[PDB]
Curated annotation (Swiss-Prot), chain B:
The homodimer has swapped domains; the N-terminus of one monomer interacts with the C-terminus of the other. The N-terminal region (the pseudo-receiver, PsR), does not enhance KaiC autophosphorylation. It may have an amplitude-amplifier function and may be involved in transducing input signals to the KaiABC complex. This domain is not conserved in all other species. PsR binds oxidized but not reduced quinones. The flexible linker and C-terminal domain mediate the interaction with KaiC, homodimerization, and are responsible for the clock oscillation function. The C-terminal domain also binds an oxidized quinone in a crystal. The keyword Acyltransferase does not apply. Changing D111E: Extends the period of the circadian rhythm to 30 hours. Keywords: Biological rhythms. InterPro entries: CheY-like_superfamily, Circadian_clock_KaiA, Circadian_clock_KaiA_N, Circadian_clock_protein_KaiA_C, KaiA/RbsU_helical_domain_sf. Residues 147-155 are annotated as: Flexible linker. Changing I248V: Extends the period of the circadian rhythm to 27 hours. Residues 156-264 form the KaiA C-terminal domain. Disruption phenotype: Not essential for growth on low light, loss of circadian cycle and rhythmicity. Changing M223T: Extends the period of the circadian rhythm to 38 hours. Binding of oxidized quinones (produced as darkness falls) prevents KaiA from stimulating KaiC autophosphorylation. This is Circadian clock oscillator protein KaiA. Homodimer. The KaiABC complex composition changes during the circadian cycle to control KaiC phosphorylation. Complexes KaiC(6), KaiA(2-4):KaiC(6), KaiB(6):KaiC(6) and KaiC(6):KaiB(6):KaiA(12) are among the most important forms, many form cooperatively. The KaiA:KaiB complex is only found at 20-24 hours in the circadian cycle (subjective night). Binds to the C-terminal A-loop of KaiC via a coiled-coil structure. KaiA and CikA compete for binding to KaiB(fs). CikA copurifies with this protein in the clock complex. Interacts with LdpA.
Amino acid sequence: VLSQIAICIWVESTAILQDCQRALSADRYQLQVCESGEMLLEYAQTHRDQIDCLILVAANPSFRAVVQQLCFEGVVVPAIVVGDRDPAKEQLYHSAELHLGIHQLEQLPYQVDAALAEFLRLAPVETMADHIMLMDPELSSQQRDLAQRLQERLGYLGVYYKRDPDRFLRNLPAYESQKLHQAMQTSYREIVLSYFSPNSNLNQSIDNFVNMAFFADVPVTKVVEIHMELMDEFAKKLRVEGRSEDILLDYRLTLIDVIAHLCEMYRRSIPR
Amino acid sequence: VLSQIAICIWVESTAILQDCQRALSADRYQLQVCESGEMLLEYAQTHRDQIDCLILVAANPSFRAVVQQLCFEGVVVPAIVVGDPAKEQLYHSAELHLGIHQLEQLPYQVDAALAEFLRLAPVETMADPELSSQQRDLAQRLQERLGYLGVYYKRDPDRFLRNLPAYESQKLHQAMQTSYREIVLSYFSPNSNLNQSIDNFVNMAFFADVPVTKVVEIHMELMDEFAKKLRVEGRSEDILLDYRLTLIDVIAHLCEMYRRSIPR
């Protein structure tokens, strides 16, 4: 039920090629091996509508110059850059490229998924050779045409619960925003106070908090900040009683627990 | 465009009631108040197709019998059970439990109750299996008003952890442990490619649809490995506690990947 994926690999090392072939051995992957920069440039130009993902080894001879020509000839497709010469510290081709170490190639089926999805997320992507300042390029929206073509093969329609955007924490008036924040703090306090207590109603308290976090579409950083606010409050409570302020670091478990619950709710929300 | 929500509440305490009226004051919510078990039973049997969500106080006289009648009669709808903050199976398996002091933000919990029922329908009724797919009908009806269509990336279910044969499952396990180890090693190190190492791991967790519990497991497995290496060094195993921060960070990233993937 999945589309075949056309992979074009520019590789000049036997060991790397073997790792790639092994990882992408399934019938789903159709591999084109390009064994020189010239071959790649020629193949890419003649097959620009037949490449779903490029895999490029950064250590290849004249890598930069080849990537520049790729950009110059308007070939912008989902990509993984393998290793480093030119694991890579910076972006070399476009803003959606993935970086993978030469010893991590067994991951390729998952990372190819990631490179495709990231390209679809960001299209039209920013080229590294082309753009150097802040925000074909007009007609390089052949990118949006590629993305549409890919999304018809690699995307599916599903039903999601319609959360009310007007009730998202970031869209509320600062007053109702303050009110929700305070309610989330009260709920979080209840989790903390109950966390290491036996037979407390901890799961219910976590669910309650997480329902607010999910339905108000709060970012994870906001949960961390609520946690940090309560640790502040608790650190003061402990210091005005004699108790040590090191029991507080056990509540990192609480924070882990809460974010994990939020994560699962998102994970559970994906249709099929 | 958001659909109006028909809430029917069986409440016998005025304080609880007023809390709910205040919380559901927005005109998106239509509130029907039933002051007795027989009045709820009477209302629900006619207006079977006119209730989007039930709010039921668990302490109410003949709670069990009322719920059993609702179930026997096939009136099974999204529900919030208030108070005994309850610990178990009072009405159905999609039911939300709220304490009397967790009612201020009821709109978000009503969203939760509706969404969970939709996710789990046909739900198991905790007071009772072919014509018991009137649930399917109701779920479909609710979905027209409470859902929207969106595009998601077609992950390959054959590569989901739960679907892998033993060999592929251990390979994935080992691959994920190796990736996580790179995070651990670079986490507190200057000029480390930290974000890249996190993304590498999170990509596998996301695309293999790994439960968050397995990410926790992998963390703990690596902490064991490092604890053995520290013991040989005559170093204290307490410094491993610092890595809770790493786990927070990795799970945060995974959560954000799911969150940002929701369409619209």
